[PDB]
Coordinates of C-alpha atoms and ligand atoms in Angstrom, one line a residue:
X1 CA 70.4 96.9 36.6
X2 CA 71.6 93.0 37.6
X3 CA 71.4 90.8 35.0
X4 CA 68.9 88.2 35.5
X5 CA 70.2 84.2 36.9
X6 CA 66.8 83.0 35.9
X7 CA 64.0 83.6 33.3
X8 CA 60.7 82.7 32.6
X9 CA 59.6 81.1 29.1
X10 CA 56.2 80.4 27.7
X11 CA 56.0 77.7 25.0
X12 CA 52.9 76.8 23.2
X13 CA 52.0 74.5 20.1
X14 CA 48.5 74.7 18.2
X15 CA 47.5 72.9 15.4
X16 CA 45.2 75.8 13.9
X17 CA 43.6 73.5 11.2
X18 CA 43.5 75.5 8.8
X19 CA 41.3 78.1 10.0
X20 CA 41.9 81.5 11.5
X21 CA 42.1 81.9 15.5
X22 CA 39.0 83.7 17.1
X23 CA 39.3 87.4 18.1
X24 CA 40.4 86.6 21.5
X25 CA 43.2 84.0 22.1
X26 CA 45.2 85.7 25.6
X27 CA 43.8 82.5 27.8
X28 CA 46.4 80.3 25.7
X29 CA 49.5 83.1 26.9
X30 CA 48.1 83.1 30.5
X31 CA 47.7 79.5 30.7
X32 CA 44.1 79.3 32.0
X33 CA 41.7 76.2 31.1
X34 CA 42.7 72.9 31.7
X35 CA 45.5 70.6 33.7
X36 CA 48.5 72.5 35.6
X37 CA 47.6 76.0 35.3
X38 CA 49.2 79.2 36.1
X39 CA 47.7 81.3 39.6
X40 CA 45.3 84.4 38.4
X41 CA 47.9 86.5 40.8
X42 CA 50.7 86.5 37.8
X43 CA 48.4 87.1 35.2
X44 CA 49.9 90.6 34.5
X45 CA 53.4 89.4 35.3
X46 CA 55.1 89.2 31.8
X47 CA 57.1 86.2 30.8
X48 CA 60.7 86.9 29.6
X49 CA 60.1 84.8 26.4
X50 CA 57.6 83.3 24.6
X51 CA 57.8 80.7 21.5
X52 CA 54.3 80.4 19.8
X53 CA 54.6 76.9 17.7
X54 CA 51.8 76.9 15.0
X55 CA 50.7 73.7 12.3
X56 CA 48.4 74.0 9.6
X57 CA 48.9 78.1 10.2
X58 CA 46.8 80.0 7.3
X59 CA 48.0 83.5 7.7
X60 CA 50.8 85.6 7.2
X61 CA 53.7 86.2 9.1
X62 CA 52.6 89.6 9.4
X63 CA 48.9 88.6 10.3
X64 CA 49.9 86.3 13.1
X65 CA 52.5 88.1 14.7
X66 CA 50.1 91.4 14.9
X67 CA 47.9 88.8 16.7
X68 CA 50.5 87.7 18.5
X69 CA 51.7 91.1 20.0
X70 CA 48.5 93.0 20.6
X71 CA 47.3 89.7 22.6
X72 CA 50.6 90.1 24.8
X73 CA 50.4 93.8 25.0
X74 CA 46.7 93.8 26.0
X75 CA 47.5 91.0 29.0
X76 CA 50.7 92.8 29.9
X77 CA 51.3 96.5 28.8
X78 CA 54.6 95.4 27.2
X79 CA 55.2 95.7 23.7
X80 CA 57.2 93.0 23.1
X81 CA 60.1 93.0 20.6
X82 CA 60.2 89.7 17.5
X83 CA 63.4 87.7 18.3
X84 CA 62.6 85.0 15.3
X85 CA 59.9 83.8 13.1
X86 CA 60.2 80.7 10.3
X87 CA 57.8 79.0 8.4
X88 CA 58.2 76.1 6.5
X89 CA 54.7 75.6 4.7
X90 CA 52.0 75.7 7.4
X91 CA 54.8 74.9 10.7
X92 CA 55.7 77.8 11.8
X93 CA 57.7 79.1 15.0
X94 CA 57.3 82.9 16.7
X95 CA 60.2 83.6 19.5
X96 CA 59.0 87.1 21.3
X97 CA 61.0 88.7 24.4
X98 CA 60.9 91.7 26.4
X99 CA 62.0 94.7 25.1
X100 CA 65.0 94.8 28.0
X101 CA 66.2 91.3 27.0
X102 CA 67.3 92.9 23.6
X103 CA 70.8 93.4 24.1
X104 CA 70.7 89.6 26.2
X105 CA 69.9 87.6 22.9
X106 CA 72.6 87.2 20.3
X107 CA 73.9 83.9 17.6
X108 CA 69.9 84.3 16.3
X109 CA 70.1 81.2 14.1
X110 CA 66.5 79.4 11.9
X111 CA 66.5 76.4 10.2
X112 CA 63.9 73.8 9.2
X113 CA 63.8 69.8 8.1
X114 CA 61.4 68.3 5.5
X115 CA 60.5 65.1 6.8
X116 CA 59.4 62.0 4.5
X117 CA 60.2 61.1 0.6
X118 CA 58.3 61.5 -2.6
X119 CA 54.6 60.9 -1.0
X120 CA 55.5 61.7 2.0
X121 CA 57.3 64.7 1.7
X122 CA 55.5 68.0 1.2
X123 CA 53.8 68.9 4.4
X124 CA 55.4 67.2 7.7
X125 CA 58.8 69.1 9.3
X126 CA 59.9 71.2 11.7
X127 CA 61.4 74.5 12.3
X128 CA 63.3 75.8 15.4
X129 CA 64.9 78.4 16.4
X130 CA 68.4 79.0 18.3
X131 CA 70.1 82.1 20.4
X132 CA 72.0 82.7 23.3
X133 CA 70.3 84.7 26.4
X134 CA 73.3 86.2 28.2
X135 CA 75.7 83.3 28.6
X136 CA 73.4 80.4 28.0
X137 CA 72.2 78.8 25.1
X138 CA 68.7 78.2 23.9
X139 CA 66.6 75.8 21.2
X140 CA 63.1 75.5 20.5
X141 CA 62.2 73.1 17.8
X142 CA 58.0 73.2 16.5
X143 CA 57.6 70.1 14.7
X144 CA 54.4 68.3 13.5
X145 CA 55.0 64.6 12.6
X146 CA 53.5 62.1 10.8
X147 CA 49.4 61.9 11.3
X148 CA 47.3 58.4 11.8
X149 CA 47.0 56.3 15.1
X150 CA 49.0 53.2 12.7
X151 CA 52.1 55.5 12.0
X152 CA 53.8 55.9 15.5
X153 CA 57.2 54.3 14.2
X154 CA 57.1 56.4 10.9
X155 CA 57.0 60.0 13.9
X156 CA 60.2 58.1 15.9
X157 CA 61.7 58.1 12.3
X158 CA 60.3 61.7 11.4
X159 CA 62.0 62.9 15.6
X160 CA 65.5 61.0 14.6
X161 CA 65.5 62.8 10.8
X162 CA 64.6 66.3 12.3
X163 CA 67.0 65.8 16.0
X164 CA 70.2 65.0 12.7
X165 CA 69.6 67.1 10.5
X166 CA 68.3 70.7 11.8
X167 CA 71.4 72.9 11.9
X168 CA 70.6 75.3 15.1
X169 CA 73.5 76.8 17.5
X170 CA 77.3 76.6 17.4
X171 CA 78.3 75.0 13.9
X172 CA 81.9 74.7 16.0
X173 CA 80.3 71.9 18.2
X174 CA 80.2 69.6 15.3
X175 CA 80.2 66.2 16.7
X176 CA 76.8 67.1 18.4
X177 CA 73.4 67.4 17.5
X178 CA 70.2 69.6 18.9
X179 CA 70.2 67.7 21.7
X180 CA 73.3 68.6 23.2
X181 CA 74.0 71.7 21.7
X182 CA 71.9 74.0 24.4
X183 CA 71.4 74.5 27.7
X184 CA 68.0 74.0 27.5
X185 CA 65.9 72.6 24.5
X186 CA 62.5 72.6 24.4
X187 CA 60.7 70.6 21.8
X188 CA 56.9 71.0 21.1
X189 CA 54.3 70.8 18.2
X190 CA 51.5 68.6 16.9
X191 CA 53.7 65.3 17.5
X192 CA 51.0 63.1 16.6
X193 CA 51.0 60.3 18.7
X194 CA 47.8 58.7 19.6
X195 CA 45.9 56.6 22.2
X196 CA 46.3 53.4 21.3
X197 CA 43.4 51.5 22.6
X198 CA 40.9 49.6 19.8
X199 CA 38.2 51.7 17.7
X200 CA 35.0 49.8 19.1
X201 CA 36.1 52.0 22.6
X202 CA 35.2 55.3 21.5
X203 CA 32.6 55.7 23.6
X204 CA 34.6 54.5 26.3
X205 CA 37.5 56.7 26.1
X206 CA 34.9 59.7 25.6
X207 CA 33.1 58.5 28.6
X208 CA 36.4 58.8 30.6
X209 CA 37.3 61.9 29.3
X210 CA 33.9 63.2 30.8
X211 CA 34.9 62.0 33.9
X212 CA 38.4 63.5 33.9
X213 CA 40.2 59.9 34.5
X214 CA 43.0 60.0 32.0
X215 CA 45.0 57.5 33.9
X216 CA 44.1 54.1 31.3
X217 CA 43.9 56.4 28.5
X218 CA 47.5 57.7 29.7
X219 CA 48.6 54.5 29.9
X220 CA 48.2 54.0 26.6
X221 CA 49.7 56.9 24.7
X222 CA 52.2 56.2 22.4
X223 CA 54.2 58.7 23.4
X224 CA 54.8 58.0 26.6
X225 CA 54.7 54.3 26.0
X226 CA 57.5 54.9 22.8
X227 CA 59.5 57.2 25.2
X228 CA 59.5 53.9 27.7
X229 CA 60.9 51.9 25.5
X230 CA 63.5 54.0 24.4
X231 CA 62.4 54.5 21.2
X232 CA 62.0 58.4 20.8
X233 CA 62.6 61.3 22.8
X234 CA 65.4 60.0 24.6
X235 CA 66.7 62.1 27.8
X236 CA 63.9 64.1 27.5
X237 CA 61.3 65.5 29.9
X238 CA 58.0 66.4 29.8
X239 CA 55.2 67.3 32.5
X240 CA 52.3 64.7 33.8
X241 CA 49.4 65.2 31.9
X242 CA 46.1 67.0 33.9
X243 CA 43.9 68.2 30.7
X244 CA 41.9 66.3 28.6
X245 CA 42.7 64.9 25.4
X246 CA 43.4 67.9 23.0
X247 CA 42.3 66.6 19.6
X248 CA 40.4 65.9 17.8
X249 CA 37.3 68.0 18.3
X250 CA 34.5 69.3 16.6
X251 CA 35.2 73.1 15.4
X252 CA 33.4 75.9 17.5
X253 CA 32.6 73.9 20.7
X254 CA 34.8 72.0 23.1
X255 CA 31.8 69.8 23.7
X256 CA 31.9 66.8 21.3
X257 CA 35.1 64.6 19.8
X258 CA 34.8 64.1 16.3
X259 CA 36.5 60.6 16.0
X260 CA 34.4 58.7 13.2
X261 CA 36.2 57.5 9.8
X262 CA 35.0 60.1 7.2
X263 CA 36.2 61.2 3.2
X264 CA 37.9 63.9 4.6
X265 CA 40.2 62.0 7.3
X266 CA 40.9 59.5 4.4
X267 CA 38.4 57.3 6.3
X268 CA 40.9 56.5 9.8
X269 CA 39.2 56.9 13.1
X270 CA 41.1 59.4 15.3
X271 CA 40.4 58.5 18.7
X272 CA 40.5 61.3 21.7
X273 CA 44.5 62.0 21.4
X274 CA 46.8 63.7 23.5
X275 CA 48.7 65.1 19.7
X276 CA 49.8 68.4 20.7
X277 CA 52.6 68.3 23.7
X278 CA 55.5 70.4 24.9
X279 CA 58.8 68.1 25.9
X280 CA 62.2 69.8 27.4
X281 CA 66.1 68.6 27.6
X282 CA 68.4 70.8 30.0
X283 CA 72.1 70.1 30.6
X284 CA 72.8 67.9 33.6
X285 CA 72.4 70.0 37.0
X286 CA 70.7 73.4 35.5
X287 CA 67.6 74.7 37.4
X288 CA 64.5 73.7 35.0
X289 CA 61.0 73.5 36.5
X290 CA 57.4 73.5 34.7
X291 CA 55.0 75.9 36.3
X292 CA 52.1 75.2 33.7
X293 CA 51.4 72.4 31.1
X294 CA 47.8 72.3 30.2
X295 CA 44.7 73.3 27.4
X296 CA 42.8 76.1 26.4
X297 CA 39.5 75.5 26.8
X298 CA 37.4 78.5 25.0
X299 CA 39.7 78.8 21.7
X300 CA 37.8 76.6 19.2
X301 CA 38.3 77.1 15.7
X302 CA 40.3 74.2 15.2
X303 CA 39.8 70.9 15.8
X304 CA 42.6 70.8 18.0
X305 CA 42.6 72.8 21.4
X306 CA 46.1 75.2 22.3
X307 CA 48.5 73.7 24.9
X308 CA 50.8 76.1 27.0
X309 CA 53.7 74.9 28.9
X310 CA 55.9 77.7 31.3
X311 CA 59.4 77.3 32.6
X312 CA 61.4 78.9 35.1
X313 CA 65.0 78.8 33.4
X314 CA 68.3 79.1 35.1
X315 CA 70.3 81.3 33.0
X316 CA 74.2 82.9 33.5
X317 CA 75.9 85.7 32.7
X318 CA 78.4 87.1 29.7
X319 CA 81.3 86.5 32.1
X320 CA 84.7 89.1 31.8
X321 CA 87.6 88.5 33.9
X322 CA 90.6 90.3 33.7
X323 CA 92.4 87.1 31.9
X324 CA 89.6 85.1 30.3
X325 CA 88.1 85.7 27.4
X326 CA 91.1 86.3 25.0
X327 CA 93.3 84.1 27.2
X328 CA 93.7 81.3 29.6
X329 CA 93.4 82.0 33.7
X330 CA 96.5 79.9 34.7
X331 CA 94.4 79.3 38.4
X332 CA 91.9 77.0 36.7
X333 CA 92.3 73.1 35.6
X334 CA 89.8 70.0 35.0
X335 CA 91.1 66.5 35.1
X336 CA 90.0 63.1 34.2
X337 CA 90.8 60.1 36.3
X338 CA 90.3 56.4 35.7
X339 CA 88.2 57.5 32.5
X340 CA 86.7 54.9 30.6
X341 CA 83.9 54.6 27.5
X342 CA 81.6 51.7 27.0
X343 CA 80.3 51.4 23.4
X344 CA 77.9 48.9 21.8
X345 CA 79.8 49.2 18.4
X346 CA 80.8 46.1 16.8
X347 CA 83.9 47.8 15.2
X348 CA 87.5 47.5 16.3
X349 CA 88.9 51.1 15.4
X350 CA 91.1 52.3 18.1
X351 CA 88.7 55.7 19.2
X352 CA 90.1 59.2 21.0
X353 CA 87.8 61.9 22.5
X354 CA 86.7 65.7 21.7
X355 CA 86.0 67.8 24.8
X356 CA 83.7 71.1 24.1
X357 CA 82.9 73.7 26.1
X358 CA 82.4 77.3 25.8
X359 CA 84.9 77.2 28.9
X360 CA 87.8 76.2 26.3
X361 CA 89.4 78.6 24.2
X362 CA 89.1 75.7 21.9
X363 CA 88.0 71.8 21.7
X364 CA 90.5 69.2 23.2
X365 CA 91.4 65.8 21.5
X366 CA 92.3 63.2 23.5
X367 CA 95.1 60.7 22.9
X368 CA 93.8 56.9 21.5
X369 CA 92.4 55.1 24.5
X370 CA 93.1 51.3 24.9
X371 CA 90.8 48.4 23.7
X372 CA 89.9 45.8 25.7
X373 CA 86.6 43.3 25.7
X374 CA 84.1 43.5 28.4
X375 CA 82.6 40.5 30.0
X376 CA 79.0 40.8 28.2
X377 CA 80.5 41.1 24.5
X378 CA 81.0 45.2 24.8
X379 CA 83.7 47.5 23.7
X380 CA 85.5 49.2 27.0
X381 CA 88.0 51.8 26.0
X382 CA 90.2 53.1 28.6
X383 CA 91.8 56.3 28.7
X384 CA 92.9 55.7 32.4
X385 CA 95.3 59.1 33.6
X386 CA 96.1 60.0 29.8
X387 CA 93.7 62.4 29.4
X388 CA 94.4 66.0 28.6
X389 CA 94.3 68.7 31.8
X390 CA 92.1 71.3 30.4
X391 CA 92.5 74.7 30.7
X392 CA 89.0 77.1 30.8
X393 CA 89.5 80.7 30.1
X394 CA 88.2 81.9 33.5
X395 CA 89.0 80.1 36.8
X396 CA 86.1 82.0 39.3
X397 CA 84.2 79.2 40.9
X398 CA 81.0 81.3 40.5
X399 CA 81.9 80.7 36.5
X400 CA 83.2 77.8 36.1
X401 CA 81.1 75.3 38.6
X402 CA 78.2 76.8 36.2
X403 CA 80.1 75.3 32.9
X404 CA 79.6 72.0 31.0
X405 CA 81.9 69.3 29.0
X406 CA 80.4 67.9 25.7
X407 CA 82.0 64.6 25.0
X408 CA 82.1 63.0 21.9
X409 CA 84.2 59.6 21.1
X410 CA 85.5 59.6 17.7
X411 CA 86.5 56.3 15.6
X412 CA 90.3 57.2 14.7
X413 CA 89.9 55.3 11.0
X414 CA 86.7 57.6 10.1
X415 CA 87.0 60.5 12.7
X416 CA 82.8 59.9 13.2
X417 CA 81.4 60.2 16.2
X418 CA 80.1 56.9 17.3
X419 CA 78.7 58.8 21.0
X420 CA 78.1 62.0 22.7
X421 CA 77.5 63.3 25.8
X422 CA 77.6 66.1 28.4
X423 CA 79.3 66.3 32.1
X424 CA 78.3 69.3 34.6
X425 CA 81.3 71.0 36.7
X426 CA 78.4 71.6 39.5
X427 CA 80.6 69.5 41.6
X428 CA 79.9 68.3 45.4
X429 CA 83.8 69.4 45.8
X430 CA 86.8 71.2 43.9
X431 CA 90.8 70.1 44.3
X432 CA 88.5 66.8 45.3
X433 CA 88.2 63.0 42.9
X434 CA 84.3 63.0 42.2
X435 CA 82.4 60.3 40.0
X436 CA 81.2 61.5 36.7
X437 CA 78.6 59.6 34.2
X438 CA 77.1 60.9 31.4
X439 CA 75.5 58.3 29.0
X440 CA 76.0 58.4 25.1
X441 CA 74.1 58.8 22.2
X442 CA 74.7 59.3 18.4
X443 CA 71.8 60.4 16.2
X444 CA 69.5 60.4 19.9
X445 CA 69.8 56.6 20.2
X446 CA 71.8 55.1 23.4
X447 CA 75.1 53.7 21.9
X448 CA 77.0 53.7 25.4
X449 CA 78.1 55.2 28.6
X450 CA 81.1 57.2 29.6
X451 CA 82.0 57.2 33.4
X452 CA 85.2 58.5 35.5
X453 CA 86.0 60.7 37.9
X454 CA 87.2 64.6 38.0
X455 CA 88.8 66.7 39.6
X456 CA 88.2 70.8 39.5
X457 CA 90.6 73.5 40.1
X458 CA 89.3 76.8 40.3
X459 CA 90.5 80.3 42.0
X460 CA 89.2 79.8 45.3
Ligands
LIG1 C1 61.7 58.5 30.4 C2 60.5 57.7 30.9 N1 60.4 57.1 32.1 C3 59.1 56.5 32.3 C4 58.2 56.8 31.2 C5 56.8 56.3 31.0 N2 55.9 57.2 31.7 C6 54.5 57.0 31.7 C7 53.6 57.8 32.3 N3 52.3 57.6 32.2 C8 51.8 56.5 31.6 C9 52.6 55.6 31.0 F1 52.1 54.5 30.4 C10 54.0 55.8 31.0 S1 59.1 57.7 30.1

């Protein structure tokens, strides 16, 4: 039986608001309703995984994932088997996969971040969820951030606090954070950004959303206007938006917005919002495509509306070769030429590199590269032809072209990272000079580039 070079994985966030889910809830697993949808032909087709995100979730563990499975079971005859489940208060996370994937999935990690302080914190967070499929790495993060159309810079704080300090995948790759750690990471939840257009237009924006034209309500979400500007969600993806705003309506229908200042919403007005959204990050180069991002449209005891996102997933295999793993496969090399780091740091340390990759028998520092100042007031540190020649632990092209280098640049005075970033050996050419970029970040925020070229030596 092969082992699989792609998968298929169902993500959804709902907001429940408080109140349990109806009896039937399988259009949100076969994404049917509203936007990009999935063709009726796959309905009994099972997805490999599935991550069910939940906020403001009342019920048990136990209740929800009894839901869970005998929804899945009744659309595809599998039983499926419970990878992962956390809950931090009401945010809660659900990984299910086939029953054959069982002996794929291994490093099952949990974790979860409180956002906020003293007022603030006691209900906002996120919890995620980390493994490997064969020899790929996975992350799914559920958060629900800050509520309240004035707040958008309080979520970009609530995304940098939760992308630092949530401890998923290989505790080994310590210069990195979530968003380099996996293969592919797929963040989702009730992320709480708003249309931002002035209260008096209610009527309007309902009016619009009748008529399916999202395109100047679109084009002024704070997401995507925040994500513009650089200011959250950095280097990630997410799907154009097809379905109509998913919050906030009133419970039982699908048929009226409830966006009028009352007591109980602490008198704010919460105009038609697109809150409850599905974004991805994959390493450079590795097959990702959507096939579904969209609404439920008949699940309506909340006052939000489902959203289901699928992926097809390039994943590889738990490669043995008759050297590597336990050695090094002599046949194999990666080199660095005419390598050079631009940072926006102020400081004057001298800085040296770390090189990761599960390719390594172990992470590679670099000797100090040289100082100088760039035209524009940056920092250029050049490593030139000093870097180290790395050795992976398997030299098959089919391996190794599949493989990734984390970077990080690390002050030599404090030994912190002050930028991270990730190369793909999917080259053009091996035994051939290529150009290589990969920008870098530190705590998700841009804080430089590194660029060079390569050159890959592998077995054939
Ligand atoms: C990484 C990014 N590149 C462009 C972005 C903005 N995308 C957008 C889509 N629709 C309506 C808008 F106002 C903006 S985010």
């Amino acid at each position: 039986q092969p082992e699989p070079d792609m998968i298929t994985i169902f993500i959804g966030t709902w907001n429940m608001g408080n109140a349990p889910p109806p009896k039937k809830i399988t259009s949100w697993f076969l994404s049917k309703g509203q936007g990009k949808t999935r063709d009726d032909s796959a309905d009994y087709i099972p997805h490999d995984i599935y991550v069910i995100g939940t906020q403001e979730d009342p019920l048990s563990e136990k209740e929800w994932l009894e839901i869970l499975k005998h929804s899945l079971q009744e659309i595809t005859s599998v039983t499926f088997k419970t990878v992962a489940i956390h809950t931090l208060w009401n945010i809660r996370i659900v990984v299910l996969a086939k029953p054959e994937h069982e002996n794929r999935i291994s490093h099952i990690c949990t974790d979860n971040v409180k956002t906020g302080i003293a007022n603030t914190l006691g209900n906002k967070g996120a919890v995620g969820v980390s493994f490997m499929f064969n020899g790929t790495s996975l992350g799914f993060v559920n958060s629900h951030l800050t509520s309240g159309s004035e707040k958008k810079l309080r979520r970009n704080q609530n995304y940098m606090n939760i992308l630092r300090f949530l401890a998923l995948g290989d505790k080994k790759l310590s210069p990195f954070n979530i968003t380099h750690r996996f293969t592919h990471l797929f963040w989702f939840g009730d992320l709480n950004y708003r249309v931002d257009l002035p209260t008096w237009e209610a009527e309007t924006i309902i009016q619009k959303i009748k008529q399916q034209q999202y395109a100047d309500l679109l084009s002024h979400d704070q997401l995507l206007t925040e994500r513009r500007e650089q200011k959250v969600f950095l280097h990630f993806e997410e799907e154009e938006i097809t379905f109509a705003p998913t919050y906030r309506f009133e419970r039982l229908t699908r048929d009226k917005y409830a966006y009028t200042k009352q007591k109980a919403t602490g008198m704010k007005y919460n105009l038609p919002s697109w809150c409850d959204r599905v974004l991805w990050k994959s390493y450079p180069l590795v097959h990702v495509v959507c096939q579904s991002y969209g609404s439920t449209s008949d699940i309506m005891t909340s006052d939000h509306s489902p959203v289901f996102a699928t992926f097809e997933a390039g994943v590889t295999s738990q490669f043995v070769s008759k050297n590597g793993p336990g050695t090094v496969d002599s046949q194999g090399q990666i080199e660095f030429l005419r390598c050079y780091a631009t940072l926006k740091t102020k400081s004057q340390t001298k800085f040296y590199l770390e090189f990761h990759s599960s390719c390594l028998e172990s992470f590679v520092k670099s000797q100090e590269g040289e100082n100088e100042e760039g035209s524009e007031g940056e920092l250029v540190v050049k490593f030139g032809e000093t870097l180290p020649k790395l050795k992976p632990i398997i030299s098959d092209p089919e391996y190794l072209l599949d493989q990734h280098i984390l970077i990080s640049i690390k002050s030599s005075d404090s030994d912190e990272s002050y930028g991270e970033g990730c190369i793909a050996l999917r080259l053009e050419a091996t035994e051939t000079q290529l150009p290589i970029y990969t920008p870098l970040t530190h705590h998700g925020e841009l804080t430089g580039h590194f660029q060079g070229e390569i050159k890959l030596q592998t077995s054939q």
